[PDB]
Coordinates of C-alpha atoms and ligand atoms in Angstrom, one line a residue:
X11 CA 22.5 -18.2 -5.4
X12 CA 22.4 -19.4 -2.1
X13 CA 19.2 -22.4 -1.3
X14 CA 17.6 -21.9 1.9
X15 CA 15.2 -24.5 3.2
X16 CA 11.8 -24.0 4.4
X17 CA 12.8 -24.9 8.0
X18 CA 14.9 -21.6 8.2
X19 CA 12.3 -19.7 7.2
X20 CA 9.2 -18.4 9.1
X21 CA 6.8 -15.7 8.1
X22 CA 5.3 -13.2 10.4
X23 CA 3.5 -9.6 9.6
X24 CA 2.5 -9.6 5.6
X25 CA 3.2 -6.0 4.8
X26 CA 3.0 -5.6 1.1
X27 CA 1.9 -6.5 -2.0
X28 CA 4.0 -7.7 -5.2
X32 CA 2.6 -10.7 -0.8
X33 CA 5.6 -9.1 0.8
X34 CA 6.0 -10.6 4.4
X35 CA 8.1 -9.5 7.6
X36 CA 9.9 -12.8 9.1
X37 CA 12.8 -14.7 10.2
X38 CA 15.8 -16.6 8.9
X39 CA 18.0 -18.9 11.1
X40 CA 21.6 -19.2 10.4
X41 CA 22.5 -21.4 12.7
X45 CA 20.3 -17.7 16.3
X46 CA 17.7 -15.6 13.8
X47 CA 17.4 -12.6 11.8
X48 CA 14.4 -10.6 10.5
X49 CA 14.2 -10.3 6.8
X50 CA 12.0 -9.8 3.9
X51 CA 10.1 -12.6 1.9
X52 CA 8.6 -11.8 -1.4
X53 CA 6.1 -14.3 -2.3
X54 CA 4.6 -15.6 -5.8
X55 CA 0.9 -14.7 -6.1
X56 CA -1.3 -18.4 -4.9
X57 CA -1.4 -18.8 -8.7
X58 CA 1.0 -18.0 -11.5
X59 CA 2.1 -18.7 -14.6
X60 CA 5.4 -19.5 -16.7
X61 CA 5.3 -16.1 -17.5
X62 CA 4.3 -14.4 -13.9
X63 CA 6.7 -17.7 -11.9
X64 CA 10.1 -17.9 -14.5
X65 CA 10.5 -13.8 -13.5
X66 CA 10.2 -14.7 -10.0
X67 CA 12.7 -16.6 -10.0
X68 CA 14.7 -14.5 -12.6
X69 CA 14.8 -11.5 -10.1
X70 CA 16.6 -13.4 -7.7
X71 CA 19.1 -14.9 -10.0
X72 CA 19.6 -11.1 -10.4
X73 CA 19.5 -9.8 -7.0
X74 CA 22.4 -12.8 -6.3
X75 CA 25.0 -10.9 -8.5
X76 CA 25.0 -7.9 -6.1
X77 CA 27.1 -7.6 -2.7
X78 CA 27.2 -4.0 -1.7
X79 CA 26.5 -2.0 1.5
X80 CA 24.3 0.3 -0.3
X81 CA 22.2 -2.7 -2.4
X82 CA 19.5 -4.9 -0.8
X83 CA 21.6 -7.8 -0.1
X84 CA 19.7 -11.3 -1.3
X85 CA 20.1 -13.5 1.7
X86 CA 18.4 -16.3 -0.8
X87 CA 15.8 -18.1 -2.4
X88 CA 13.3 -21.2 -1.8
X89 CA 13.2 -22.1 -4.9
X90 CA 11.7 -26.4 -4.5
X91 CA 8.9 -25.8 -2.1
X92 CA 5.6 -23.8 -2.2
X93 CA 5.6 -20.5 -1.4
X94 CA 8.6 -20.0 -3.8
X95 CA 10.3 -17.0 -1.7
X96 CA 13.0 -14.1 -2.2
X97 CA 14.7 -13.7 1.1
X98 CA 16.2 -10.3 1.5
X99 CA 17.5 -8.4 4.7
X100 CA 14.6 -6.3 6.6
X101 CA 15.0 -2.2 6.1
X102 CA 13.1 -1.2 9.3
X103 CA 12.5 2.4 7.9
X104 CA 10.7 0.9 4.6
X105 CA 11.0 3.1 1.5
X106 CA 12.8 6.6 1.2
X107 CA 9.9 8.4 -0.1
X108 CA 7.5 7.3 2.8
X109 CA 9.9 7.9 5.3
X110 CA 10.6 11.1 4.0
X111 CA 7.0 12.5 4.1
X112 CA 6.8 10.9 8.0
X113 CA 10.2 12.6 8.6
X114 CA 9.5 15.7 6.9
X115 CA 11.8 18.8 8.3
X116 CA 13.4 17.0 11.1
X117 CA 16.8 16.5 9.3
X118 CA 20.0 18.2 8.8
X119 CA 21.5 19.3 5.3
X120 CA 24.6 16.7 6.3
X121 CA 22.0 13.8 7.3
X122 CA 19.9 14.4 3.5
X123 CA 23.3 14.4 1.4
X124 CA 24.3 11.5 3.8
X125 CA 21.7 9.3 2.5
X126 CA 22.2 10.4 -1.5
X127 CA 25.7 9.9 -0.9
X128 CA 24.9 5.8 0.3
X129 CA 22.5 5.7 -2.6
X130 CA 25.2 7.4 -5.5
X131 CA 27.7 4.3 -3.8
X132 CA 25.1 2.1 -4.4
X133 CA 24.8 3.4 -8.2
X134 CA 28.5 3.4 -8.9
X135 CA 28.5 -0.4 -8.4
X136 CA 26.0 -1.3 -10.2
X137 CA 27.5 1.2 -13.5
X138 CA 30.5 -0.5 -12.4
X139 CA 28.9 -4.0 -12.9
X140 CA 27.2 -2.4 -16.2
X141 CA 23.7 -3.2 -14.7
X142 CA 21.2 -0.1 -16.0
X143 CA 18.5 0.1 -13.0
X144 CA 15.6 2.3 -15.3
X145 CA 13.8 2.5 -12.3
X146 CA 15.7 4.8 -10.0
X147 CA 13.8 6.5 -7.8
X148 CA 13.1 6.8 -4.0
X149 CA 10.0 4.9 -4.0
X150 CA 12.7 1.9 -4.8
X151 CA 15.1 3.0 -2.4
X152 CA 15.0 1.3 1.4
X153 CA 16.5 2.5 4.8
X154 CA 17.4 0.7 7.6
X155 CA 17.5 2.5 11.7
X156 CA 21.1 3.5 10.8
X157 CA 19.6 5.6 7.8
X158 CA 21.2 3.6 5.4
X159 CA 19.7 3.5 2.4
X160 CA 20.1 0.8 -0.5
X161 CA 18.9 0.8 -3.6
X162 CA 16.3 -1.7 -4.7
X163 CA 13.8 -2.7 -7.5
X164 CA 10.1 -3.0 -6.8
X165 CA 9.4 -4.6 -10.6
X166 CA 6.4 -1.8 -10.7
X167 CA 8.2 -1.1 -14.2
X168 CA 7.1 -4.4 -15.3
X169 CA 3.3 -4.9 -14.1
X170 CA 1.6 -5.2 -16.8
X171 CA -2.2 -4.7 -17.1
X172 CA -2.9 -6.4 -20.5
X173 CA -5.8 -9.0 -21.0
X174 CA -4.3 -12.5 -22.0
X175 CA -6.2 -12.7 -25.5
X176 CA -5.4 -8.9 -26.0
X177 CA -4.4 -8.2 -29.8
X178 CA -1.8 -5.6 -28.7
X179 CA 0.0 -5.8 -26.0
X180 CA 3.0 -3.9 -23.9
X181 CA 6.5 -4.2 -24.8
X182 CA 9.4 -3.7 -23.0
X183 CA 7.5 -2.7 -19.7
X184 CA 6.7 1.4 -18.7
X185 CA 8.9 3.9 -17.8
X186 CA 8.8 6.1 -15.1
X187 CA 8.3 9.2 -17.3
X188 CA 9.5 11.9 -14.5
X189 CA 12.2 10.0 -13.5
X190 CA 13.6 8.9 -17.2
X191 CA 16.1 10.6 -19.1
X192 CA 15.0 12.1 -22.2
X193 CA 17.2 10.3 -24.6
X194 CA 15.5 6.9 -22.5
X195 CA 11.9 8.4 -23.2
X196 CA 12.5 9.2 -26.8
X197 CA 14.8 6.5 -27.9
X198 CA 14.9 3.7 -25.4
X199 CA 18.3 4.4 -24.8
X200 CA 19.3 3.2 -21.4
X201 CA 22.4 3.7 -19.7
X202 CA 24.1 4.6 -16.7
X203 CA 23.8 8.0 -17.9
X204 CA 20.3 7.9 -17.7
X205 CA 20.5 6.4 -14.4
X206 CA 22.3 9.6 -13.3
X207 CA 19.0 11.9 -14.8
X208 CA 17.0 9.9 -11.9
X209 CA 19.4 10.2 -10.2
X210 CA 19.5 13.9 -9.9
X211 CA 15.4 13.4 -10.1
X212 CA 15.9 11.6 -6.5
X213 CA 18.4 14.2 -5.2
X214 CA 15.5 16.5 -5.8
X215 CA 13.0 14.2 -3.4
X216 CA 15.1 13.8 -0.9
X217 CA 16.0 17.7 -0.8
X218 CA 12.3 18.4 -0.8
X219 CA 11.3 15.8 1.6
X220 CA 9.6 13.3 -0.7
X221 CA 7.6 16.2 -3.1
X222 CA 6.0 15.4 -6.5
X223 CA 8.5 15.9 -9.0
X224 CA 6.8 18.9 -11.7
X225 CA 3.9 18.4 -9.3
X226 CA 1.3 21.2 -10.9
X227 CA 2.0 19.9 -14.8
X228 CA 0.1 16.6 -16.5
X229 CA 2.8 13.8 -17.6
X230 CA 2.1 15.2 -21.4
X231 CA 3.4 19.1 -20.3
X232 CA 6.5 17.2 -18.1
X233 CA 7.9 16.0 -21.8
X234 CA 7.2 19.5 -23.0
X235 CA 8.9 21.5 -20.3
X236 CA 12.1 19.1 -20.3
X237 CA 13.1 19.1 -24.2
X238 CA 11.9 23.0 -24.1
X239 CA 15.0 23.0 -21.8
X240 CA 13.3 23.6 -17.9
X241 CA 14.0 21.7 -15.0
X242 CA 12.8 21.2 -11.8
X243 CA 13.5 24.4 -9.2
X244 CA 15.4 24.2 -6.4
X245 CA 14.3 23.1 -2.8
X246 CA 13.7 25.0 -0.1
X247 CA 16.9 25.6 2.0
X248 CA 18.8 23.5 -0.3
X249 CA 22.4 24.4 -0.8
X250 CA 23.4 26.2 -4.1
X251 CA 26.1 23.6 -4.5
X252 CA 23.1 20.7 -3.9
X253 CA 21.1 21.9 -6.4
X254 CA 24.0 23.0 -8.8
X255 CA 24.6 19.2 -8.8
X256 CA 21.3 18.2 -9.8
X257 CA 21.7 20.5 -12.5
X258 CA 24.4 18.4 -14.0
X259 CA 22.6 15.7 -13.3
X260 CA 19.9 17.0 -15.6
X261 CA 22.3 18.5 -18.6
X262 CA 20.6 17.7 -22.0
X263 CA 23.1 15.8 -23.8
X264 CA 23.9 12.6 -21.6
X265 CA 27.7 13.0 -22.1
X266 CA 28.3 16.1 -20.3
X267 CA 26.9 14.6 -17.3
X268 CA 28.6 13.6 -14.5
X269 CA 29.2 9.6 -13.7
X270 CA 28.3 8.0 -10.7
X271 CA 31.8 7.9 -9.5
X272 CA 32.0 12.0 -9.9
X273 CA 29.2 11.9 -7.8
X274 CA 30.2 10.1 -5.2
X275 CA 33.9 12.2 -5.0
X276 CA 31.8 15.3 -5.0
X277 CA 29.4 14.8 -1.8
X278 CA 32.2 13.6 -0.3
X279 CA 33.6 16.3 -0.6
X280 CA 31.0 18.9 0.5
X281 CA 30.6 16.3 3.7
X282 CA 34.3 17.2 4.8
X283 CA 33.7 20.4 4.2
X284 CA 30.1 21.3 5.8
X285 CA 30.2 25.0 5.6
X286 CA 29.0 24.0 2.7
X287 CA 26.1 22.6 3.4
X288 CA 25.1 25.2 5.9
X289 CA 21.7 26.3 5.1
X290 CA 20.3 29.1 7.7
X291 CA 17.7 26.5 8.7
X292 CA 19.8 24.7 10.6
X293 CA 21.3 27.5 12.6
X294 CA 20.4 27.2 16.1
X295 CA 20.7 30.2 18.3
X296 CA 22.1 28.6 21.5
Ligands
R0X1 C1 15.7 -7.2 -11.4 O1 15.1 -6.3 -10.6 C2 15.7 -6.1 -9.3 C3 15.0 -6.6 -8.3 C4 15.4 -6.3 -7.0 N1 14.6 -6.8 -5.9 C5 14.4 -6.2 -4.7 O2 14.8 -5.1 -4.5 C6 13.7 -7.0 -3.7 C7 13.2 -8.3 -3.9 C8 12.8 -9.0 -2.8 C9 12.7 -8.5 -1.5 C10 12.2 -9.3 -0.4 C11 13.1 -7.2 -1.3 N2 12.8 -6.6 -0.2 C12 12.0 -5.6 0.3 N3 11.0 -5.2 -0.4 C13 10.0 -4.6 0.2 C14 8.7 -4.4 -0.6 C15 7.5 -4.0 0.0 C16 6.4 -3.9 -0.8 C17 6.4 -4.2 -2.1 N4 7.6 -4.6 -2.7 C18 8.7 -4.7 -2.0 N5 10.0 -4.1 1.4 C19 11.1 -4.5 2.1 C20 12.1 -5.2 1.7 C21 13.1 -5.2 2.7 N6 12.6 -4.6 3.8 N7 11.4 -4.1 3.4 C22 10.5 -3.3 4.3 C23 13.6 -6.4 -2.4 C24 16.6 -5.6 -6.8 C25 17.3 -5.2 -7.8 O3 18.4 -4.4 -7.7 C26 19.3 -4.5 -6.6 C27 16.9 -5.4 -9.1

């Protein structure tokens, strides 16, 4: 990856936890960006991931990906430079923006993050966490697809006689094959995916929000699905459908995706949904 020096780098407004700060980079003028730092005290365990992320995050140049500006990787705070999203995480903005988009402006953003998808299958990287609480938006409403690791906190004491393998899995987001069997692929990636169509279409709701995790599994291999937004197109949610078929398969790829919002975008009558009709 790319070395930046600690003189380039200068940290600002922490916003998160992981700390997660707002700063800026010089290249030469500055740029805001994103600097995830290693908790004050790690171990080989909790610092060689930190590191591995970014090693990760390096391999991926795409307008709809988090783009890795780079790392400090000889100086303390270690730190994962990454370009700023303004409009933080889909879900979130969602929930703040709730009702005041258009059909075209909602498949606008699941058509960024389906591009963003495509090349990562295309890279054969398997994400396993695809949901919009790991997507981030810019002020252009871009979105790009990230990974907030929240798959792999673990919880386990240190002298614990069993512990966590493999990290967790977002149960209503993962594909049941991934649940059952632990088989990840890009064709799981598509079940979230259709799982995120769903959030964005409803504005950032609960996915099966009135069952326990324990009656999601039941409902799923007893063959129901989540129900459709409000307003949403039939062919929106006729998509997520596929998105959800049982046997992985039959469903559609990432690129299939892609061509077929694309497709409704250029053809928006599509898309209409009566509440976007204005009278005047
Ligand atoms: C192996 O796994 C992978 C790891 C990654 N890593 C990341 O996506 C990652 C790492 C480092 C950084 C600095 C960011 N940047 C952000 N993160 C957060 C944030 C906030 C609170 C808590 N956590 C995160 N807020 C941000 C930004 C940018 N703007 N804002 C408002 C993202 C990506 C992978 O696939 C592409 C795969």
């Amino acid at each position: 990856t790319t070395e930046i020096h600690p003189s380039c780098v200068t940290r600002q407004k922490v916003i998160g936890a992981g700390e997660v700060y707002k700063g800026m980079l010089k290249t030469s003028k500055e740029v805001p960006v994103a600097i995830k730092t290693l908790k004050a005290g790690y171990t080989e365990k909790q610092r060689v991931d930190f590191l591995g992320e970014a090693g990760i995050m390096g391999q991926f140049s795409h307008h709809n990906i988090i783009r890795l500006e780079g790392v400090i990787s000889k100086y303390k705070p270690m730190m994962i430079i990454t370009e700023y999203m303004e409009n933080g995480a889909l879900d979130k903005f969602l929930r703040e923006k709730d009702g005041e988009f258009s059909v075209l402006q909602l498949v606008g953003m699941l058509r960024g993050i389906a591009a963003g998808m495509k090349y990562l299958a295309n890279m054969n990287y398997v994400h396993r966490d695809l949901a919009a609480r790991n997507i981030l938006v810019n002020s252009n409403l871009v979105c790009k697809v990230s990974d907030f690791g929240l798959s792999r906190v673990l919880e386990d004491d240190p002298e614990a006689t069993y512990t966590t393998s493999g990290g967790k899995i977002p149960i209503r987001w993962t594909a049941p094959e991934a649940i059952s069997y632990r088989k990840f692929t890009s064709a799981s990636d598509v079940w979230s995916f259709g799982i995120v169509m769903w959030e964005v279409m409803t504005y950032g709701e609960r996915p099966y929000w009135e069952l326990s995790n324990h009656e999601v599994m039941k409902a799923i291999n007893d063959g129901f699905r989540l129900p459709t937004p409000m307003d949403c197109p039939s062919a929106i949610y006729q998509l997520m459908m596929q998105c959800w078929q049982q046997e992985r398969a039959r469903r559609p790829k990432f690129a299939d995706i892609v061509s077929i919002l694309d497709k409704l975008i250029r053809a928006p009558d599509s898309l209409k949904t009566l509440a976007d009709f204005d009278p005047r």
